Ligand binder design. Structure first.
Ligand SMILES: [Mg+2]
Ligand SMILES: [Mg+2]
Ligand SMILES: [Mg+2]
Ligand SMILES: [Mg+2]
Ligand SMILES: [Mg+2]
Ligand SMILES: [Mg+2]
Ligand SMILES: [Mg+2]
Ligand SMILES: [Mg+2]
Ligand SMILES: [Mg+2]
Ligand SMILES: [Mg+2]
Ligand SMILES: [Mg+2]
Ligand SMILES: [Mg+2]
Ligand SMILES: [Mg+2]
Ligand SMILES: [Mg+2]
Ligand SMILES: [Mg+2]
Ligand SMILES: [Mg+2]
Ligand SMILES: [Mg+2]
Ligand SMILES: [Mg+2]
Ligand SMILES: [Mg+2]
Ligand SMILES: [Mg+2]
Ligand SMILES: [Mg+2]
Ligand SMILES: [Mg+2]
Ligand SMILES: [Mg+2]
Ligand SMILES: [Mg+2]
Ligand SMILES: [Mg+2]
Ligand SMILES: [Mg+2]
Ligand SMILES: [Mg+2]
Ligand SMILES: [Mg+2]
Ligand SMILES: [Mg+2]
Ligand SMILES: [Mg+2]
Ligand SMILES: [Mg+2]
Ligand SMILES: [Mg+2]
Ligand SMILES: [Mg+2]
Ligand SMILES: [Mg+2]
Ligand SMILES: [Mg+2]
Ligand SMILES: [Mg+2]
Ligand SMILES: [Mg+2]
Lengths: 154, 65, 116, 117
RNA sequence: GCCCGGAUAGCUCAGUCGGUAGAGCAGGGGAUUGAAAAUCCCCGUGUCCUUGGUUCGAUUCCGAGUCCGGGCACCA
RNA sequence: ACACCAACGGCGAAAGCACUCUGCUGGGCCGACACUGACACUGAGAGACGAAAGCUAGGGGAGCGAAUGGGAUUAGAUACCCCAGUAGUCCUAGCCGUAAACGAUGGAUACUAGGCGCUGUGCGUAUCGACCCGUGCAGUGUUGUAGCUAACGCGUUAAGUAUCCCGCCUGGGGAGUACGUUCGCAAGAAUGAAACUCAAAGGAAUUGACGGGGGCCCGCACAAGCGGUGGAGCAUGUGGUUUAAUUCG
């Protein structure tokens, strides 16, 4: 990636809901490229989240990702022979990426039975701000602010 | 009492203009360069090096421009 | 061989040649010094012996020792020597190793202030 | 403790740290704030950010005594020379004069030798 | 023999003018770091010496018991 | 100890010499005929001066700082870094006499394109006083023709073309050592061998390779991701041992 940058790729829409977001999450949930299974898992997650609460799940998505989206993180810099943690600010696409990822990660580590149950458990816990995927983001902020002194681009 | 740089702030004050006026005062008297210079000690040789270097720098910057 | 080096893998391979007890002990000694002081970095010592000349082949009697070091972090320390006697060859390789090693330790472990 | 309408702010900026002292024209010290007293240690203790929170932290106590106009004194080559000034501005205190007092010897005591690093 | 002060997390001590038991290290985890350390943040544990009394209830106040840390003495 | 002034500027025989002032005094250069009329140039021995460190005697002691001590770093660190800090650095009176005391270029004279500069003065012009211009000298700096040089380069301030005087060199180690003398309070300085041993030691330029020197740029090289190896069991390849052979590569 030294020379050429990256051209933009078509942002798709999930077939049932016509969403860019839901399609993002069904792509990141994917393993061994069986879309057949991923769509099923995610739709039964929407089914259990509409089962547990009567609120529109289309909104619980935006609450879940607004909830776990880091606005800042750190990065390792080599400056003056000193190895620094420098709080580099995060782009939007990268924010949604990180979001979906810690969500999915904490979703794969749950004690439960199905994956639809786990994903719904964690969308329910992130939309209230009540769980590991929000906690993780807040830790990234805690370690961003303790290191706030090392950003000279401030 | 004594002073090097005098910046008097009027009541038209905004932060950026004050900050840059002061920055150019410090640049004008050359103070930070001066206290980086007197931080450590120099033999006559590094003094001649600094004289030729800096003087020919600003002098060639006057003769080219 | 050494206890403080117990964490290190000393691999002694005759290529065309038969390894004796004196060659063993000598390898342990001369590689021993080389590595011992720098032990914290070092990982695996690979020593191959290649003999040629005299009654085996054409050309002078050459015994050639190749060694290879790896460190926990940096890899590829390569040392190639040609000489008369096995013993001489080993002494040569150890002379090289020492230098390359303490060059690595020098670079990295100096808290070298590298500003850029 | 003491309510003084006008006085001076001394900001010393060195390379390892910056001191911000609040005083009055009678030449008397009221209250000071150092980049070290803010819970910063050696490395971070030099950055302009700690100078920012230092100045802010002194001016807390200066508005608490209800003071209005002030002169700013900046001593030393360090970074905080610029940064601290911003804090003095944004803390909503009227800025009278900003002077550079950094001592310039006209010749003198022979400085320490050059570090060979 | 007298005179003081203590017993509080594994260790070292802060303690409302009775209504929550707390700090600093030892530990666990995370990166810090190509690796060390600083750098940094999280988490765990309690019969507040033993007994009774007082009190709407006590680490807190009081009595007795036990141990510990010091200060000062005397003509078998 | 003397910021700014300070400059590819001034004076000095060299060393060196800079806050300011005054006093005693050394030279230098320029313009006039005012005068002497070869009085010149160099210099063995000899003399005087001679940075810094060092030493003797007496003062003085802020900062800095050999030595020394502690803290780190490191395999080690009698070093680099940090914290302290004694001699010394300063002044008076001496001694020492060496430096990359370098222009790495002895002194005097004569003679050989220029261009661009500066400092001190003199002349003419400009105005009638500051420039300004053109020029005469004296020194000082940068490019460069002839010529020189092994090349780099030097080039009116020669390393050019000639004359005179003086010092010095005659392959590298051994060695600026030993011995002996002269000088020194000491440290040392000055003068300066030989046995032995080597077939090289050296200069300038050139093509490479290399640099924990620069500048520019690439690559799933790192980063950002996704899955593996290393752990388990087996499959298999190799080393090792074992064997009559575990064929050789
Ligand atoms: Mg580019
Ligand atoms: Mg620093
Ligand atoms: Mg002169
Ligand atoms: Mg001087
Ligand atoms: Mg005179
Ligand atoms: Mg006559
Ligand atoms: Mg002579
Ligand atoms: Mg003398
Ligand atoms: Mg001296
Ligand atoms: Mg002595
Ligand atoms: Mg004395
Ligand atoms: Mg002293
Ligand atoms: Mg000191
Ligand atoms: Mg020491
Ligand atoms: Mg002592
Ligand atoms: Mg040590
Ligand atoms: Mg001191
Ligand atoms: Mg003297
Ligand atoms: Mg000499
Ligand atoms: Mg000199
Ligand atoms: Mg002119
Ligand atoms: Mg001339
Ligand atoms: Mg020249
Ligand atoms: Mg020339
Ligand atoms: Mg010549
Ligand atoms: Mg001689
Ligand atoms: Mg000879
Ligand atoms: Mg004598
Ligand atoms: Mg000596
Ligand atoms: Mg001779
Ligand atoms: Mg050469
Ligand atoms: Mg190169
Ligand atoms: Mg390069
Ligand atoms: Mg690869
Ligand atoms: Mg990667
Ligand atoms: Mg395996
Ligand atoms: Mg064959």
């Amino acid at each position: 990636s030294r020379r050429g940058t990256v051209e933009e790729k078509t942002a798709k829409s999930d077939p049932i809901y016509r969403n860019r977001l839901v399609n993002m999450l069904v792509n990141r949930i994917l393993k061994h490229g069986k879309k057949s299974l991923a769509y099923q898992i995610l739709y039964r997650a929407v089914k259990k989240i509409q089962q547990k609460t009567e609120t529109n799940p289309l909104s619980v998505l935006r609450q879940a990702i607004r909830g776990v989206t880091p606005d800042i993180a750190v990065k390792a810099r080599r400056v003056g022979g000193s190895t620094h943690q420098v709080p580099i600010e995060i782009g939007s696409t990268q924010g949604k990426a990180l979001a979906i990822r810690w969500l999915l990660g904490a979703a794969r580590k749950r004690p439960g039975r199905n994956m639809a149950f786990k994903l719904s458990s964690e969308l329910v816990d992130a939309a209230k701000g009540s769980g590991d995927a929000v906690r993780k983001k807040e830790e990234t902020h805690r370690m961003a602010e303790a290191n706030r002194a090392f950003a000279h681009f401030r | 009492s004594a002073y090097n740089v005098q910046v008097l702030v009027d009541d038209n004050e905004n932060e950026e203009r004050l900050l840059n006026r002061f920055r150019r005062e410090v640049m004008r008297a050359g103070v930070i360069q001066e206290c980086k210079r007197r931080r450590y000690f120099e033999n006559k040789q590094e003094e001649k090096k600094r004289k030729h270097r800096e003087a020919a720098k600003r002098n060639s910057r006057r003769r080219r421009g | 061989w050494d206890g403080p080096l117990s964490s290190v893998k000393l691999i002694l391979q005759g290529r065309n040649l038969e390894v004796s007890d004196n060659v063993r002990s000598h390898v342990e000694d001369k590689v021993g010094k080389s590595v011992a002081k720098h032990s914290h970095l070092v990982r695996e010592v690979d020593v191959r012996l290649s003999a040629r000349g005299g009654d085996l082949s054409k050309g002078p009697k050459l015994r050639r020792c190749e060694v290879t070091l790896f460190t926990k972090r940096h890899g590829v320390i390569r040392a190639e020597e040609d000489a008369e006697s096995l013993y001489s060859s080993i002494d040569l390789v150890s002379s090289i190793i020492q230098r390359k090693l303490r060059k690595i330790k020098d670079k990295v472990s100096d808290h070298g202030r590298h500003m850029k | 403790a003491r309510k003084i309408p006008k006085g001076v702010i001394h900001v010393q900026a060195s390379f390892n740290n910056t001191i911000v002292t609040v005083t009055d024209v009678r030449g008397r010290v009221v209250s000071w704030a150092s980049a070290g007293t803010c819970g910063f240690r050696g490395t971070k203790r030099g950055t302009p950010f700690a100078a920012q929170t230092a100045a802010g932290n002194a001016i807390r106590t200066v508005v608490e005594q209800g003071m209005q106009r002030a002169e700013v004194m900046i001593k030393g080559p360090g970074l905080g020379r610029d940064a601290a000034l911003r804090a003095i501005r944004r803390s909503g205190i009227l800025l009278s004069f900003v002077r550079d007092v950094t001592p310039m010897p006209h010749n003198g005591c022979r400085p320490p030798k050059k570090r060979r690093v």
